[PDB]
Design a protein around this ligand. Structure first.
Ligand SMILES: CC1=CC[C@]2(CO)CO[C@H](c3ccc(O)cc3)[C@H]1C2
Ligand SMILES: CC1=CC[C@]2(CO)CO[C@H](c3ccc(O)cc3)[C@H]1C2
Lengths: 244, 9, 236, 9
């Protein structure tokens, strides 16, 4: 497959070119917030982002080489991690705030509008702060986002009878290629050999926190749907079902 | 399944 | 400090030296399991393991430099991840089984003894399978478990800076082991990534297990120790 | 808090 024959520079270029757009919220800024209305804005936005994500996924080198079944599994597993890493990236330049959309920039006190949400806001903001502390670069961001896509559900490919871990060599080869790409990016930026492995680990450990936030966010979203606070799109309902 | 369809379409 | 002055070999030595004992279950093998009895055995074991984990933690280079509050935070965040990676490691050479204790080796199907537990078993077994695929080494394992302790709660805190310096030293140590093993630069970087990406799956499993344990507590299927209850209550 | 006590001891 071509994805394996891409140079590191080619990988980066492909990922950068695949990036989804930053969408706007429907927020009417002359109107107030309620718990219901804020959850409505956030889930309306997420629904629209999901469509763009699915089409981004197809442009991640190696993803189309997978079966449709595997493609579904990976996205079902990682969708909220992917939305969340994007959010944290967008919010880097806005300390103490989350840039859900250019017309929906919320501080943690606005998170208190929704019961249980400020806890999620705080974790997202802490990650945004880590991104700043690390001076995370766009080329690194796109690598990490593709890693989430390919990695998050790779350990839950279980055989139909026996439920033994299926070997997914191709996915791991592509993951190895993205590792190669990250190292190349860091070397290009003048990081020493030692700094390269140190930063590689710092970046990958972020993904543990992102998983944590995804899990907590999923439970919170599920609570909102189970209390009839907001109606979720059929797509979002199905992405939630895949997990509560 | 919406995801399945969107991935194919 | 002291952690930052350790060589890679000395870090490995320290971590190996700190390793907690493998505990036994009070399991009576002549009697069939029930949902209540199995959950009781699992939580009794976890409670006893927790006491040893606290001693181990205090021996992880860098950990004792932190304030008592920060030590509590890290352990509260990571305790189930740590129990689980320990479990996965113990079970590595037992395909399809989870070695909770030497005298409590459970098949995948025995997870069905408890409502909703087989899903967690499946994830643990998949991790153990992955460890097997990678030929994870004991020295790598102890590095990973120490990374979990220091990393999992670090974002949500000069405390952070020091912990990240210690984390960097553990990364150095992992690479050192890979170099010693004869891996090329490219192989070293790839393997480091492979290992750290497993920690995302471990976090996932901890969160799922935490929810399951909490449901077994709410349904009162089994009583939990005051310690276990407090570690669980830390997550909600 | 038990963890607190255990860490002190
Ligand atoms: C998808 C989401 C909806 C609402 C929550 C609270 O339930 C907070 O907003 C979050 C979010 C994250 C990234 C996005 O791009 C959109 C919404 C998460 C969780
Ligand atoms: C601490 C645990 C208790 C019971 C659960 C299901 O609720 C299954 O056992 C798990 C476990 C993991 C590692 C151990 O050393 C002991 C038990 C987890 C989750």
């Amino acid at each position: 497959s071509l994805a394996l024959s891409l140079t590191a520079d080619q990988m980066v270029s492909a990922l950068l070119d695949a990036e989804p757009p930053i969408l706007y919220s429907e927020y009417d800024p002359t109107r107030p917030f309620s718990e219901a209305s804020m959850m409505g804005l956030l889930t309306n936005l997420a629904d629209r982002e999901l469509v763009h994500m699915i089409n981004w996924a197809k442009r991640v080198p190696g993803f189309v080489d997978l079966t449709l079944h595997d493609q579904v599994h990976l996205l079902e597993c990682a969708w909220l991690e992917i939305l969340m890493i994007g959010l944290v990236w967008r919010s880097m330049e806005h300390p103490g705030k989350l840039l859900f959309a250019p017309n929906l920039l919320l501080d943690r006190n606005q998170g208190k509008c929704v019961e249980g949400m400020v806890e999620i806001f705080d974790m997202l903001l802490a990650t945004s702060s880590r991104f700043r502390m690390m001076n995370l670069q766009g080329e690194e961001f796109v690598c990490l986002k593709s890693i989430i896509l390919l990695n998050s559900g790779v350990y839950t490919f279980l055989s139909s009878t026996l439920k033994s871990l299926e070997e997914k060599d191709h996915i791991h080869r592509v993951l190895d290629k993205i590792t190669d790409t990250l190292i190349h990016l860091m070397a290009k930026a003048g990081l020493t050999l030692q700094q390269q492995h140190q930063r590689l680990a710092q970046l990958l450990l972020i993904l543990s926190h992102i998983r944590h936030m995804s899990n907590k966010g999923m439970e919170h979203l599920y609570s909102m749907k189970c209390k009839n606070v907001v109606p979720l799109s059929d797509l979002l309902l199905e992405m939630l079902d895949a997990h509560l | 399944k919406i995801l399945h369809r969107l991935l194919q379409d």
